[PDB]
């Protein structure tokens, strides 16, 4: 038949981290005529922390046994961002900026 | 027939941290004319935190199981932002500026 | 038949931490003429602490035994945002910002 | 027939946490002419602490048994913004800016 | 037959915490002209703290059982918002402005 015998005895664990970063973050996009974003992001990470913790337990004996195990992702995704013109524009996000002009003159 | 015997005696465990920092922000975003924001992440993460603790614990003996675990995603998403036109503008998402100007002076 | 035996005795676990920052956050968006946020975010996401906890026990033998887990996920979402014309905007998301002028003067 | 035994004996759990930040907040969008927001976040997140706790207990012998775990989610939303014409807008959501003007001046 | 034999004795369990921040929040939103606000959040999420409970205890003998847990989300959701135009809007959601002026003069 078999045997899966595990003995654990006076463990000492501490200090186990798991930490990620910010992540994901659009900031400071300013736009002089439009700004367009198309935020779709997929997000399957895993942050984890295990300490003194098992896996699954099975006792499953006798043959014919079939494990599957499937991830299946698929993008057809379809973007479009489309802008027809743009003109006679000033954009200053700077700061403390002076006599900042745009002119535009046409004798049709 | 088989066993499984775990034996977990005198275990000290601490400080089991898991941390994931800000995510999927948007900030700070001006537009001069508009501001076109499409915004469909999708989140399937896991930050997880595992001390001392086991899985599944199953006892199926008999031949012929089958086990599927499947995971399916299908992304068929269609996006369009479309802006016709955008003219004589100013935008000024700085501080302190001073003397800004646009000027169209048209003639037919 | 088999036997699963499990044996906790004198376990001392402390300070199991599951922390997720800040998620999905839109801030400070201004817009001159017009802002469009279509905003559908898909969260599936686990941030999950186990202490000295245990998962399903199930004691089920005999032969042919099916276990099917399945998670499907579709996307066929439509979205368009769509502005026709925008012209003679002034934005002035800044401070302390002096003499902010647009000008559009015709002559048909 | 079988056996599943757990023993748990003397443990002493502490401090199990489980935090997630604010999420899907929409702050501070001024728009000049309009705004437009669909929000339609879909949300099955899971903030969970599970400290000396179990999963179900089957006992359920016998062949053939199908167990079926299926979450299915099908998005075939249909999202519109339109917007004809703006124009001669002055949006100021800044603080301390003085002589903000706009012109259109039209002679057909 | 089998037997599931669980023994949980002196067991001292403490400070299980489960926390979410505010969410779904939509704050601070002025528009010049309009504000359009579609607002359609379908939530499931769970936030729970499991201390020394069990799950469900099942004893079914015999063979040919069905267990199936589903669960099925369609959406087909129709959103349009419409502005047919905007124009001489004078917006100042900003503090202590001054001569904040919007002209259209037209001469036909």
Do not use: A, W
């Not at 954009?91 to 403390?96: A, K, Q, T």
């Amino acid at each position: 038949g078999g045997k899966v015998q595990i003995i654990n005895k006076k463990l000492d664990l501490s200090n186990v981290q798991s930490k990620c970063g910010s992540k994901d973050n659009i900031k400071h996009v300013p736009g002089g005529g439009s700004v367009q974003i198309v935020y779709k992001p997929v997000d399957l990470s895993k942050v984890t922390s295990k300490c003194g913790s098992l896996g699954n337990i099975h006792h499953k004996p006798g043959g014919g046994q079939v494990e599957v195990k499937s991830e299946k992702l698929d993008f057809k995704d379809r973007v479009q961002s489309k802008i027809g013109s743009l003109d006679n524009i000033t954009h200053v996000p700077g700061g403390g900026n002076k006599k900042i002009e745009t002119h535009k003159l046409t004798f049709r």
